[PDB]
Amino acid sequence: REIVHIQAGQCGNQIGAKFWEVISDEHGIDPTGSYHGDSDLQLERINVYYNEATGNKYVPRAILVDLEPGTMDSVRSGPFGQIFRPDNFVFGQSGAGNNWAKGHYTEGAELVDSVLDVVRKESESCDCLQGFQLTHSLGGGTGSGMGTLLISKIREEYPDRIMNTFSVMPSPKVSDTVVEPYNATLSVHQLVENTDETYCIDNEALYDICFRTLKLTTPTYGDLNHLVSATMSGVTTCLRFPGQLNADLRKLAVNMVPFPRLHFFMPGFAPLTSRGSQQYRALTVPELTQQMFDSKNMMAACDPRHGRYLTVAAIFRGRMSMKEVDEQMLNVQNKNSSYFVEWIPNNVKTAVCDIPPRGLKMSATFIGNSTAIQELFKRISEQFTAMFRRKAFLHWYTGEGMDEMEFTEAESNMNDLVSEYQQYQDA
């Protein structure tokens, strides 16, 4: 039951590379692609993310995409850079200049068919392809513009497969350019229509976790990405190891998405411990559970108490009491029942995996479909309008053939998305 991974642009390829480093370590795959683990539990579902090559090697089913070669050269020379299939590096030279239009309509349009050819080659080697996962940012040009172009094309050629994305939302707190709200709004417009599941990873949240909780005065993008790759490992554990719950992309979607447009998830991770003496402290299941539901552990800068949970997936990792996990999960729901919509009975599902992540004896990853996510889109909308009011910086886009109407339409649909969340928050 194969998944095809795609990583687009600078952010996409950098978190993507980190993701493959992390899960390769978990599955016992070294940078050469050789298995050197001591558990058949590691290889039982390794087919989901890896192709088996000659010499008994394991090759990520991963396609690396960018409109400039820079970041992908750094991936190639990175720790696990050698593991990737060289034919799956698809790149241009021009770059996208943080311009959604360039990624979606001009520069990316020239490269997209090359990417689709590689996607097709990978899909053809699948016994039964379940779908796709894309890693990208929404604030740039390539990951945002070309990434959503790719998603549209893939849906056309594979309309009955699941589309999943890890989408990094822009924040003024951690920003490269002022046009990020434009690029993001244009992208959300695409994601609302053409994905089944989207993990909303807010750079604002990643920074605040690094600053407040982890006590890092000056976080780099690399430190932000450690949080993302750890979270990505967690949310895909059910796909990568034997289990009952959300074991594939479609079953997850059926459990998490009560209405097709409302498929934007808040991910969370625990423990998040600052360095010092307490880093060695043993964590209990009650502490894990409380922290995983804590807003300060969420990867989307939204207050869960400002909305209601439609659905929740929780996944615990490591050796621990299944009985204790069940008891604590029930405690959360029963002690905070008003925050879980009563018109979706039993909307919290829990999985437990024996294999813990590197450097932790136990951890917990949170996936919430909360109406509080509307705060995220409201933020982008306000930032969008502040500029669009005066048509500021629009010439970068109109120069690539876009019209103002397309901005108006993107904004309206994102505002519709927000009001749809508010509807069910009040229901």
């Binding site: 350019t177 002022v178 005066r390």
Partner: protein, 440 residues
Amino acid sequence: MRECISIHVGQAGVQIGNACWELYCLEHGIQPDGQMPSDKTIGGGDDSFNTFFSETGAGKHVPRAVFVDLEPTVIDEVRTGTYRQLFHPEQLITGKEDAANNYARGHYTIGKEIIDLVLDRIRKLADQCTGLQGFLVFHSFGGGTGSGFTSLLMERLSVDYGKKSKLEFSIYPAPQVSTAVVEPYNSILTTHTTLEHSDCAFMVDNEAIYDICRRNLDIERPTYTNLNRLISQIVSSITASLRFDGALNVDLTEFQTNLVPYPRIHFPLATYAPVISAEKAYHEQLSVAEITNACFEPANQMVKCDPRHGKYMACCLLYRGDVVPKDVNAAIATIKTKRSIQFVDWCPTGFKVGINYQPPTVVPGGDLAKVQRAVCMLSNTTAIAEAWARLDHKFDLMYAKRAFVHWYVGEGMEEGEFSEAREDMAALEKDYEEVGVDSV
């Protein structure tokens, strides 16, 4: 790739070109004969410095540059000077008769006779690029060639290279070193003609540089040599993002995204620090906080104007040398609480920061102290329109009497071109006023 071609037009453009390329060579360890011992890839490469330097099989690193002047004596000094081996003879182009401080002669009478040759030589450079990014054009506002020929060239470049990016370093006139009464005419004419053909223009007010040399370097009566060495440091700061690589080194094109909110609003204000003599730099460490604070002292600006009485539309900080993000962030925090920094209501207030680790370089026999860290701020402020206002007023005083206009008419120009140019400048001043007004 992402090659950049520099075009140096007229005396000011050429002489500033000399100072810039000398500095570049010293920054990259390139000798006057073009040899670069540290470059192990002979005859080519795609290193960061290759954006500005091509390479010959014999190991020569050659500026991707063309020098153009309508008289020979300035460029002749390049041909016989220290760095004569640096340039191929075909890169240095001269006529026999200059524009006589007349825009008309630079754009029409004299310029037309050499424009095709210039374009052919530029084409020769372009054809050697594998991914040409665009052009940097150095010129005065006040000269006949700097004004007239530049605008002709910019028009022709838009035709032959489409929307390929074109940046300017433009020398704005000051009475302390100006050489023509009609420089306000030439300034308005070239600004009007070039406006649609330029993506971004860095104005350099000669009076600002003059004042800085007098006050900060204790130079009693600055010469062009004094002015140009300072100007080169500022140009270097701006281009360093293109010529060096580093994890925190933000490309100029990315700053441009923030700096140009509308096509006509493409004139960033540059502020540079530290400008300090060796005598005063001795046993004096200027910290990140100190040089950053100096960016909001208007005395350190490249153009005389007062941002404290205008509104910001962007603020970019380009650091070079011994600088880490921690210290930058602390410095900016302090400034946010103390200075007069008001943004328009339609743009974010965050400062965009780039850091290049290669430290600032100085030319031997120069006036600037060698420092461990420097910064160039690029801001988009409504205040820069002050520079337009002053020039336009000088223009109006003379044009109301049609003083000197017969010189332009005699070379085939019409009064309609003057009024058309002036009207465009009036609209431009109005544009800078409008962007500053609050939203509904």
